Design a protein around this ligand. Structure first.
Ligand SMILES: O[C@@H]1[C@@H](O)[C@H](O[C@@H]2CO[C@@H](O[C@@H]3CO[C@@H](O)[C@H](O)[C@H]3O)[C@H](O)[C@H]2O)OC[C@H]1O
Ligand SMILES: O[C@@H]1[C@@H](O)[C@H](O[C@@H]2CO[C@@H](O)[C@H](O)[C@H]2O)OC[C@H]1O
Ligand SMILES: [Cl-]
Ligand SMILES: [Cl-]
Ligand code: NA
Ligand code: NA
Ligand code: NA
Ligand SMILES: [Zn+2]
Length: 371
């Protein structure tokens, strides 16, 4: 199993073309990087914007829409026959503050007057509809898959008490899906995206919510499982149980932001890519082998598997790769070991099947084969 250039390796999307599409999250500058471009054309047939289609990127100020960056990804996808996923119409992060300010410029969350609160709810819901309307009216014919809402369920099994819920309640979710369907039509597929969808009580709460919304006529086509996972968790058994229960509701499933971290949580990362022991790459590969075997077994319930990145030289996991140092200045990776200081987000993770030098990793061989 040679460490050959990925540009000379069997195409990943081709290996899985009858099971599900294979996607990657991208930043516009990568479309100007020869290697990244070659990777997208060679191995992927689905693309998503890592950041430029989030609320704050699209409408940073009410009335100021910036589709320039998003357009670059759409244009590239079209020129290369790739499906496109829109990430994301609604989220509590990377969302402009102006959405949640009242007519006097005060946080709607701070309103005590009931009358005033109902007014703010309807105001927020209007802004939500316009945001969604403008985006969907532009891209409805080019983008097939949409993360209509992202992370709206808390890890405590309750709805996430973000400004969206505090101000408008459960209705912000209903309005989001309805507006997307209204302006995009019956052909675009609408998804509720989240992480730790395999963990209780979140899993069942998400399950109950979509069950209830669907029963109320709210248009929801599938569930997006972010899948920011580790080498050992979640177990394949729980991943399977998760996919099955949502499939039972008539929902499509997409693995939307897959990365297999070399670490646990919170992460105790190595400071550089080269410091990561070769054994970790073998463990990671066995995980990828089991993971994709399961994805295939469940192919009639999964339409897409997207990696949150192209190759190891670029991954948001590095922002979470905290490096712990003991009193002697030595790196500490043992989860239950002494340490004196931590340098947050200064280390390096290696989550993909493609290395930082664009050569295939043990994990590539594990999922490209037929065993
Ligand atoms: O300083 C800003 C950065 O913090 C920001 O980083 C991005 C944060 O979002 C990441 O993507 C999310 C990861 O978690 C999932 O649950 C979400 O669905 C994803 O959208 C992304 O990878 C990071 O690049 O970038 C902008 C900076 O200004
Ligand atoms: O902001 C979100 C992060 O908080 C999230 O991180 C997860 C938190 O729960 C832990 O159990 C998981 O291991 C960890 O990945 O990731 C998604 C991001 O949007
Ligand atoms: Cl990133
Ligand atoms: Cl390497
Ligand atoms: Na290196
Ligand atoms: Na990035
Ligand atoms: Na395999
Ligand atoms: Zn190498």
């Amino acid at each position: 199993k040679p460490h050959i250039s990925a540009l000379n390796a069997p195409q990943l999307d081709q290996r899985y073309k009858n099971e599900f599409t294979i996607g990657a999250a991208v930043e516009p500058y990568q479309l100007q990087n020869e290697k990244d471009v070659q990777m997208l054309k060679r191995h992927f047939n689905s693309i998503v914007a890592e950041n430029v289609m989030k609320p704050i990127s699209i409408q940073p100020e009410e009335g100021k829409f910036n589709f320039e960056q998003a357009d670059r990804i759409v244009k590239f996808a079209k020129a290369n026959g790739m499906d496109i996923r829109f990430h994301t119409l609604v989220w509590h992060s990377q969302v402009p503050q102006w959405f949640f300010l009242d007519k006097e410029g005060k946080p709607m969350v701070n309103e005590t007057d009931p009358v005033k609160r109902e007014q703010n709810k309807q105001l927020l819901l209007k802004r939500l509809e316009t945001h969604i309307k403008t985006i969907v009216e532009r891209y409805k014919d080019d983008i097939k898959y949409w993360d209509v809402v992202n992370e709206v369920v808390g890890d405590d099994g309750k709805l996430r008490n973000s400004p969206w819920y505090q101000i408008a309640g459960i209705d912000y979710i209903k309005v989001a899906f309805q507006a997307a369907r209204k302006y995009g039509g019956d052909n675009i597929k609408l998804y509720m995206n989240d992480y730790n969808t395999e963990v209780e009580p979140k899993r069942t709460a998400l399950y109950n919510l979509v069950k209830q919304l669907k029963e109320e006529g709210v248009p929801i086509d599938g569930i997006g499982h972010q899948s920011h996972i580790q080498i050992g968790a979640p177990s394949e058994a729980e991943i399977e149980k998760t996919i099955n229960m949502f499939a039972a509701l008539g929902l499509d499933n997409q693995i939307t932001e897959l990365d297999v971290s070399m670490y646990g949580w919170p992460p105790r990362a190595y400071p550089t890519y080269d410091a990561i022991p070769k054994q970790k790459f073998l463990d990671q590969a066995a995980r990828y082998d089991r993971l994709f075997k399961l994805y295939e077994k469940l192919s009639d319930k999964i339409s897409n598997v997207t990696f949150w990145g192209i190759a190891d030289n670029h991954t948001w996991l590095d922002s979470r790769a905290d490096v712990y140092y003991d009193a002697n200045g030595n790196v500490v990776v043992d989860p239950n070991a002494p340490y004196a200081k931590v340098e947050k987000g200064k280390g390096k993770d290696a989550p993909f099947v493609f290395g930082p030098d664009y050569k295939v990793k043990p994990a590539y061989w594990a999922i490209i084969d037929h065993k």
